[PDB]
Design an enzyme around this catalytic site. Structure first.
Site, PDB file in Angstrom:
ATOM      1  N   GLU D  57      -7.154   0.059   8.737  1.00 55.23           N
ATOM      2  CA  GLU D  57      -6.200  -0.902   8.214  1.00 55.23           C
ATOM      3  C   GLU D  57      -6.421  -1.359   6.818  1.00 55.23           C
ATOM      4  O   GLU D  57      -6.893  -2.433   6.643  1.00 55.23           O
ATOM      5  CB  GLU D  57      -6.183  -2.132   9.092  1.00 55.23           C
ATOM      6  CG  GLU D  57      -4.975  -2.969   8.912  1.00 55.23           C
ATOM      7  CD  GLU D  57      -3.761  -2.299   9.541  1.00 55.23           C
ATOM      8  OE1 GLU D  57      -4.003  -1.298  10.276  1.00 55.23           O
ATOM      9  OE2 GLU D  57      -2.596  -2.758   9.321  1.00 55.23           O
ATOM     10  N   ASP D  58      -6.070  -0.573   5.822  1.00 57.83           N
ATOM     11  CA  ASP D  58      -6.068  -1.065   4.437  1.00 57.83           C
ATOM     12  C   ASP D  58      -7.444  -1.371   3.891  1.00 57.83           C
ATOM     13  O   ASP D  58      -7.563  -2.247   3.029  1.00 57.83           O
ATOM     14  CB  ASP D  58      -5.209  -2.328   4.246  1.00 57.83           C
ATOM     15  CG  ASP D  58      -3.706  -2.044   4.345  1.00 57.83           C
ATOM     16  OD1 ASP D  58      -3.168  -1.434   3.356  1.00 57.83           O
ATOM     17  OD2 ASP D  58      -3.085  -2.426   5.393  1.00 57.83           O
TER      18      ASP D  58
END
Ligand SMILES: [Mg+2]
Ligand SMILES: [Mg+2]
Ligand SMILES: [Zn+2]
Ligand SMILES: [Zn+2]
Ligand SMILES: [Zn+2]
Ligand SMILES: [Zn+2]
Ligand SMILES: [Zn+2]
Lengths: 49, 275, 117, 392, 455, 98, 67, 49, 51, 46, 73
Positions: D57-58
């Protein structure tokens, strides 16, 4: 093509974008005029047409 | 133990830079752990303290300190007898745990001067110089061959500093990498199916995959196990390639035998009766 | 400057043991070894030497966290052979293969190669 | 690098990269930006792979040995400026060495780093414990008759010291006089920010993300030469975001870095870019759509899925974690209402507004609610009359 | 400590955590708690507050501690489930073509916490021991919870396939006595679903055992993923020549069909649709054709995908992204619109000066013939940039308005509360309800049920 | 001093009263990279109400083609209100019609 | 600002190959061949040099190399 | 003399317009720097269209 | 009603696969700055004496 | 003790070490730039 | 309490009372007490105008007026 030959020569010979406009091959167009022109995307389309 | 196999070695090719070899009849975990030692555990000498006397150059000081640490250093003859800094009884430094470098340059000339690896001098005997330009008769010698342009200087700038190189290994910082790179490959025809190709025709064949020369591409065998690992260790130049391999194995032996001594230390001190 | 000094990744601390052994509370002839300041390089290979042995019922290792230098090795043996001796043999055998590998590599170099020095 | 002559500039705040590179895949429009002359990032070897989840996630797994070899390292300069104001009738500010015997200040930080003129000199290391300039403000002249002399009577302190850049070295010190004709200084501090967990990076396609962990060369997954990736970005960043351009750029880049000529990426042409690139990359000797056989670093086994790897120009951004952290135990109290400071720059405390209050209510943790909103910001005891409710 | 972030939109935005001190300076937190805080590690920072007595520490541990915050009383479902890579990695692991040899199984067993201590017998004894993926997943399930279905995966033939021999089809997931019998796990099994494995676990085992279940699923499935691997490159974005031909041909037919409807319209004889002007009849019709055109080629591209498309593997687990994305990258992007209509005539009767006046064709008024992979043509790009604004602006407005609507609402109801005789009353002690919610039950303990007697 | 003042603060004109709408017109030139500056100098601003307006002067009118950037606008509260001039676009200085 | 000692991705020293490269390009318009002769096989080592911009040269030109 | 008009950088009335690239580098000024922003009280200030 | 509080901290979040569902990694510097008041009892006294 | 203070362009010491106003002799400039300390520091090549 | 020009140390008369700004506390070196009701010159503290529009300063409850030229505001 002669205009392009001048732009390549511009690397030493005196020339300018202003000369290119004085030839009358290029123009300036504002958003109000741009409403009435019939503007084409590429020489390709305008020839192939 | 009876179930330990004698592996086996073959050197395919050796140069002043590369060493390319095949290990056979052994375990992957051995191959992978030994590849990891070649990177991290093999010790070497690199600049570790930089003291800047005068720096008028257009590069900031910490930048000079960075470029300068990263430059390579011959160590083969001396990396062994040298001791680790923290272990050494001396306060600060000494001849017995470190070697000293000195750099002094000023641009008095009208043309831009370059500061290079040869201009760096070892106060220590020329047993451990910089990598480039010494005993030379090197066909690798081309134009300037400064090995590294530490900085450039225009008329008026000057640079004076001291440096202390120290022995350490790659786990602690990348300046201590004894390798330019490490190729590792096993089972080139993908017999064992450790990877699963979608449309196998779309993949090329390495120089090790030449066996069936044919285009049949990957005959399967499920009763097999990983065997015959291909290596190509490449020298950064600061330590010759075979010496990297022999020092890696010994260091690994030293690390293992030490863990055996602590495990012995558990049976001797605090008698092994817990389990 | 909340970053740890890089030497701490590998340098042993004066208040910590190199190895620790604790008994399992669940099943017999199981054992748990804690190896401090030692990563996958030692751990992965000791796991494999234990798997090579035919009397080991279970062998595995886990490095609990990336940021914390420590691994655990759990081993379970048949109700006859002790897990400590298996660990002792596993290193000693590993020492033997690596010594033979170093010997065989060095002699292999001893081949009339002219760039050995 | 933001302009050439930065070194003779006391810009109040600046960030420069050690090694900038022009991008491998470039637009023709970039020639006229001179973005070749002063680029903003590095050509990373990226793998779009899942790995150990520290990139979920990022975030990204970034290669630690590359940051050792100076990958994206930068220098940070803060210029502090101070003025010697005359300030009217009967007061004066002075640049000098403050002593606890002669001035009203005595703040706990150390004065010893200062020179005898009140202002440090370049090269001495400073920190949040140090004073950079010794300014003092002579004020009362003597407007307290008869022997209220003792010591430190003549002048108050108000000298300036490091809050923020709580470590670094002094780059430059400049003494001059400005347009009022007052003595004026600018003193510059240099710091070096190594790319670490919490620095925000972004590639060129609008995918920004934080550095989730860093693994050393030994641990990254590898291939052939073992050209271990300098970053692993998660596959999930692409599908819902369809940033396909990001995926073509590695592929165009792979051909450009290998063939050895900077690649075209100008938006509208008939260069059949997906096919034509795939055909060229294969003629050179790779899987034509860029996949490579990767091995994991932990056990050396092959990774069963082939992983898309190759270069991409990436950006390190001005948002770096050590400036952003914050905390407070007990601090300065503003006597407008006497609750904790709001200027974080001056050791503030975070807010706990109506919505956070509303959740404690929704949990039903009343005791913790009174605590945050009373004992732990602002407790007070007042006596009230039992007859009438005035605190008078 | 109590951990929070802003904007705090509901009670599950601030929950208790136990600290564990580490190197470097960011709060490092579990990946699964990402969806309750609506966090992204794209530079979002979060806030922590520490209790200062045993009394508030007791109150936090019991009420607001995270593991208790699993099933939200807003809609009696899990607030948090297995998300991203792990969710994709679970699908991939549970497929019954996955086999594990003694060495890897032991390592996964090793990463699991509450492991029994006994090593399970491999589903394949000879020639060599192998454990199936379902088998190792089955050690992760706590105690013995049970649920059929709770998949609704793309798989099979909805409405009539299960009635066709129950040729097990393997799709549907069945778990029995704490062992996974068959099927593949996805977001509908593992996610924030009403009947997910995670919801049942909270209920049957109790919140502490459910937390160990989340940790277990993740460390173990995650560890596997590491050897197996995952990715997406240009190889997961192209289809074959024949599909590519079929897409262009479907579009070429549909464009001719639009020109055909324009030809009918200019003839003045179209015959309008009920309650609409003739342009609306016309506009409703071309819009039907272009949408049908997108959907036809969209259904063609999903068919054309191979089994190995990682892009299809992310879509199917339900991890991230969806069918429409596949449509847009592989096939054709389709009609853009703004304010629910096709791109307006900005200039005199035209969208751009590049077109003729009054040109109702698809492309000239905002249909994108291309896919993101082939790249957009210049006009399509600008009509696409127009479709890009409506969403960015919508974002900035909705944030302001909803922030205001929520504050006003809480501010009304705040003082209402259930009293000890269980009538619900506000501040001046007026009765709101005689029993809370008309039955006096809790919202986090309810479930969907079928009433047999409506047969 | 009058030109010195208005241009520095960013205010505009009389200060005592005139400053209600035409506020924020001068700014310190951002210098974080080379691009921020070129982009900053080539920025243009539409004035607007503030704090809650929703309408059509925020979406991307067709006539901006060739004139203002398609995508290049603050990701924040003032989305679509502060715009940036395209790459070739130009501006008239104007002169006597005589 | 001058080419880094050792390529980021792997380690192969690379500053030494910069001065050599400007000479080869002056001699031949063969960037492929230039990189090859220098020995920069794999492309990580190649991007290093191929994508560098030597800002130092413009930077040195200020007179005041004195402050 | 009536007052002081702030010049904008490198415009036709700010001395930098006339000098060449070597001269401008001699004045410690960047050759690539674009100009067209005023300098006030030490701070570089740009007017927004 | 919206007060500034003490004992508050803020940093970036980054993911961590090894934490349990309710653990949080806290920077060592933030952990050193923020304090909890334990009250001395005749049991932990030896432990607190060490601290 | 002197406080050096190299000046701009002239490349010579400013000789000022007292309270007198800052201005470099001979050279017309009036910007200064306090000189580097002789005090040793240290830098790790890590 | 009028005898507090910074003195209140219980066991011994004061010699020094250092200001530990960061902790918000007043410290007495040769022992260890803490005596403080802390203020860091109220003039830094009210200065909580910042991220909000500061060019106009809505928070300015205090004009400067420049009294040292004059006397009577
Ligand atoms: Mg978010
Ligand atoms: Mg998210
Ligand atoms: Zn020594
Ligand atoms: Zn009263
Ligand atoms: Zn390289
Ligand atoms: Zn001078
Ligand atoms: Zn005292």
């Amino acid at each position: 093509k002669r205009h392009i030959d001048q732009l390549k020569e511009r690397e030493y010979n005196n020339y300018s974008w202003q000369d290119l406009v004085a030839s009358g091959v290029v123009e300036y167009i504002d958003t109000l005029e741009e409403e009435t022109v019939m503007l084409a995307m590429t020489p390709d389309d305008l020839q192939e047409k | 133990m009876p179930y330990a196999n004698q592996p086996t070695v073959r050197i395919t090719e050796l140069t002043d830079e590369n060493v390319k070899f095949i290990i056979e009849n052994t375990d992957l975990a051995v191959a992978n752990s030994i590849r990891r030692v070649f990177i991290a555990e093999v010790p070497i000498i690199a600049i570790d303290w930089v003291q800047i006397d005068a720096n008028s150059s257009v590069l900031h000081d910490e930048f000079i300190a960075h470029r300068l640490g990263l430059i390579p250093l011959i160590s083969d003859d001396i990396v062994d007898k040298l001791q680790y800094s923290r272990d050494c009884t001396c306060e600060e430094f000494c001849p017995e745990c470190s070697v000293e470098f000195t750099l002094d340059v000023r641009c008095n000339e009208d043309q831009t001067r370059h500061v290079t690896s040869r201009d760096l001098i070892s106060n220590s005997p020329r047993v451990i110089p910089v990598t480039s330009r010494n005993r030379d008769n090197d066909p690798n010698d081309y134009v300037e061959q400064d090995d590294i342009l530490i900085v450039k200087l225009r008329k008026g700038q000057e640079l004076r500093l001291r440096a202390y190189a120290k022995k350490g290994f790659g786990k602690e910082h990348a300046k201590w990498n004894p390798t330019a790179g490490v190729a590792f490959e096993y089972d080139p025809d993908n017999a064992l199916r450790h990877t699963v190709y979608p449309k196998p025709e779309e993949w090329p064949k390495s120089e090790y995959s030449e066996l069936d020369e044919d285009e049949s591409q990957a005959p399967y065998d499920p009763n097999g196990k990983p065997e015959r690992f291909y290596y190509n260790v490449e020298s950064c130049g600061s330590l010759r390639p075979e010496t990297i391999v022999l020092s890696a194995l010994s260091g690994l032996k030293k690390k293992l035998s030490d863990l055996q001594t602590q495990l012995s230390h558990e049976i001797q001190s605090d008698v092994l009766t817990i389990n | 400057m909340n970053a740890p000094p890089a030497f701490e990744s590998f340098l042993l601390f004066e208040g910590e043991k190199k190895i620790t052994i604790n008994k399992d509370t669940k099943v017999p002839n199981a054992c748990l070894f804690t190896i401090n300041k030692e990563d996958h390089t030692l751990g992965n290979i000791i796991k494999s030497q234990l798997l090579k042995d035919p009397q080991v019922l279970f062998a595995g290792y886990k490095v609990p966290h990336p940021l914390e230098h420590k691994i655990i090795i759990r081993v379970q043996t048949t109700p006859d052979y002790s897990p400590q001796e298996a660990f002792t043999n596993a290193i000693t055998d590993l020492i033997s293969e690596l010594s033979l590998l170093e010997e065989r590599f060095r002699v292999a170099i001893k081949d009339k190669q002219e760039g050995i020095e | 690098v933001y302009i050439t002559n930065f070194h003779v500039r006391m810009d109040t705040l600046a960030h420069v990269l050690y090694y900038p590179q022009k991008p491998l895949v470039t637009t023709r429009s970039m020639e006229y930006l001179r973005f070749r002359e002063l680029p903003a990032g590095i050509n990373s070897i990226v793998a779009i792979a899942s790995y150990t989840g520290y990139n979920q996630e990022d975030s990204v797994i970034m290669n630690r040995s590359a940051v050792d070899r100076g990958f994206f390292r930068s220098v940070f300069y803060r210029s502090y400026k101070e003025q010697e104001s005359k300030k009217g009738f009967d007061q004066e500010e002075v640049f000098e060495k403050p002593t606890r015997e002669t001035c009203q200040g005595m703040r706990h930080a150390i004065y010893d780093k200062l020179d005898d003129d009140g202002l440090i000199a370049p090269g001495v290391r400073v920190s949040g414990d140090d004073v950079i300039i010794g300014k003092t403000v002579t004020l009362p002249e003597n407007e307290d008759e008869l022997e209220s002399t003792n010591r430190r009577y003549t002048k108050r302190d108000c000298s300036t010291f490091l809050r923020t850049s709580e470590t670094g070295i002094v780059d430059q010190v400049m003494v001059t006089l400005n347009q009022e004709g007052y003595k004026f200084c600018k003193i510059r501090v240099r710091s070096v920010r190594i790319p670490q967990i919490g620095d925000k990076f972004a590639s060129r396609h609008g995918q920004k993300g934080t550095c989730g962990i860093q693994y050393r060369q030994e641990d990254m997954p590898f291939t052939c030469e073992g050209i271990t990736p300098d970053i692993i970005i998660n596959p999930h960043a692409i599908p819902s975001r369809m940033t396909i351009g990001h995926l073509i750029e590695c592929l165009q880049g792979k051909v450009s870095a290998n063939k050895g000529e900077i690649g075209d990426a100008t938006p509208f042409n008939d260069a059949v870019n997906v096919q034509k690139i795939s055909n060229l990359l294969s003629d050179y000797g790779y899987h034509l759509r860029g996949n490579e056989v990767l091995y994991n670093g932990f056990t050396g086994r092959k990774i069963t899925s082939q992983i898309f790897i190759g270069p991409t120009y990436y950006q390190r951004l001005k948002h770096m974690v050590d400036d952003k952290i914050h905390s407070r135990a007990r601090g300065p109290i503003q006597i407008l209402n006497r609750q904790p400071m709001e200027g974080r720059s001056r050791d503030g405390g975070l807010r706990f507004g109506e919505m956070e209050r509303d959740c404690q209510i929704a949990h039903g943790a009343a005791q913790f609610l009174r605590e945050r909103l009373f004992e732990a910001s602002d407790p007070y005891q007042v006596h009230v009359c039992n007859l009438c409710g005035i605190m008078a | 400590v109590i951990f929070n972030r802003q904007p705090t939109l509901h009670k599950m935005s601030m929950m208790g955590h136990r600290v564990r001190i580490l190197p470097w300076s960011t709060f490092r937190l579990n990946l699964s708690v990402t969806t309750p805080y609506n966090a992204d590690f794209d530079g979002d920072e979060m806030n922590l507050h520490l209790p200062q007595s045993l009394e508030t520490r007791a109150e936090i541990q019991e009420l607001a501690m995270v593991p208790r915050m699993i099933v939200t009383p807003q809609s009696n479902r899990p607030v948090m489930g297995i998300v991203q890579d792990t969710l994709t990695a679970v699908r991939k692991f549970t497929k019954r073509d996955v086999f594990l040899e003694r060495g890897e199984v032991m390592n996964l067993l090793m990463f699991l916490s509450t492991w029994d201590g006994k090593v399970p017998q491999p589903a394949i004894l000879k020639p060599r021991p192998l454990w199936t993926g379902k088998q190792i997943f089955s050690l992760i399930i706590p105690g013995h919870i049970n649920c059929i279905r709770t998949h609704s995966t793309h798989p099979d033939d909805e409405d009539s396939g299960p009635y066709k021999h129950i040729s097990p089809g393997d799709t549907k997931v069945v778990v029995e006595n704490g062992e996974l019998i068959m099927g593949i796990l996805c977001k509908k099994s593992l996610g924030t679903s009403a009947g997910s494995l995670v919801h049942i676990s909270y209920l049957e085992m109790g919140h502490d055992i459910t937390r160990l279940f989340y940790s277990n699923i993740q460390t173990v499935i995650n560890n596997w993923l590491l050897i197996e691997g995952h990715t997406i490159g240009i190889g997961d974005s192209i289809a074959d020549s024949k599909t590519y031909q079929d897409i262009q041909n479907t579009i070429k037919k549909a464009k001719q069909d639009v020109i055909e409807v324009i030809e009918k319209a200019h003839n003045n004889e179209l015959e309008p649709t009920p309650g609409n002007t003739l342009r609306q009849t016309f506009e409703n019709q071309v819009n039907r054709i272009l949408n049908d055109a997108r959907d036809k080629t969209g259904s063609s591209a999903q068919k054309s995908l191979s089994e190995y498309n990682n892009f299809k593997s992310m879509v199917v687990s339900g991890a991230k992204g969806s069918k429409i994305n596949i449509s847009q990258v592989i096939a054709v992007v389709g009609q853009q619109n703004v304010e629910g209509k096709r791109i307006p005539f900005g200039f005199k009767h035209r969208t751009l000066p590049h077109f003729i006046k009054d040109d109702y064709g698809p492309e000239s008024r905002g249909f994108v013939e291309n896919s993101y992979l082939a790249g957009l043509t210049p006009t399509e790009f600008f009509f696409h940039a127009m479709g890009g604004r409506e969403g960015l602006i919508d974002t900035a407005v909705k944030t302001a308005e909803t922030g205001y609507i929520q504050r006003r609402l809480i501010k009304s109801m705040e003082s209402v509360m259930v009293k000890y005789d269980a009538t619900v009353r506000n501040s001046i002690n007026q009765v709101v309800q005689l029993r809370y919610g008309e039955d006096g039950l809790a919202g986090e303990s309810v479930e969907f049920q079928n009433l047999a007697t409506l047969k | 001093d009058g030109l010195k003042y208005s241009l520095a603060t960013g205010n505009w004109g009389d200060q005592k009263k005139a400053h209600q709408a035409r506020a924020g017109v001068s700014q310190v030139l951002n210098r974080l990279t080379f691009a921020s500056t070129l982009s900053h100098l080539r920025r243009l601003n539409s004035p607007i109400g503030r704090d809650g307006k929703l309408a059509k002067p925020r979406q991307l009118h067709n006539t901006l083609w060739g004139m203002v950037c398609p995508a290049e606008t603050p990701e924040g509260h003032a989305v679509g209100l502060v715009k940036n001039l395209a790459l070739m676009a130009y501006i008239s200085v104007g002169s006597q019609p005589s | 600002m001058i080419i880094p000692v050792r390529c980021f991705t792997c380690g192969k020293i690379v500053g030494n190959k910069w001065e050599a490269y400007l000479g080869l390009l002056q001699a031949e318009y063969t960037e492929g061949d230039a990189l090859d002769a220098l020995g920069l096989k794999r492309y990580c080592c190649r991007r290093m040099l191929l994508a560098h911009v030597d800002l130092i040269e413009k930077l040195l030109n200020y007179a005041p190399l004195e402050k | 003399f009536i007052g002081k008009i702030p010049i904008m950088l490198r415009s036709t009335y700010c001395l930098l317009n006339g000098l060449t690239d070597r001269d401008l580098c001699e004045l410690n000024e960047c050759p690539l720097d674009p100009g067209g922003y005023f300098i006030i009280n030490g701070s570089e200030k740009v007017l927004i269209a | 009603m919206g007060k500034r509080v003490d004992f508050s901290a803020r940093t970036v979040i980054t993911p961590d696969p090894n934490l349990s569902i309710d653990q949080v990694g806290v920077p060592r510097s933030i952990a050193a700055n923020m304090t909890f008041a334990e009250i001395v009892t005749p049991f932990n006294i030896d432990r607190l004496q060490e601290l | 003790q002197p406080m050096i203070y190299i000046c701009g362009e002239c490349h010579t010491e400013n000789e000022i070490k007292s309270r007198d106003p800052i201005r470099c002799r001979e050279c017309g400039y009036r910007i200064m730039y306090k000189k580097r300390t002789k005090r040793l520091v240290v830098f790790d090549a890590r | 309490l009028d005898a507090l020009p910074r003195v209140t140390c219980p066991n011994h008369p004061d010699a020094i009372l250092v200001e530990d700004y960061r902790a918000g506390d007043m410290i007495c070196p040769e022992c260890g007490l803490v005596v403080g009701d802390r203020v860091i010159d109220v003039g830094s503290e009210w200065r909580t105008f910042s991220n909000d529009k500061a060019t106009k300063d809505p928070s300015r409850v205090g004009d400067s007026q420049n009294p040292l030229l004059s006397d009577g505001d």
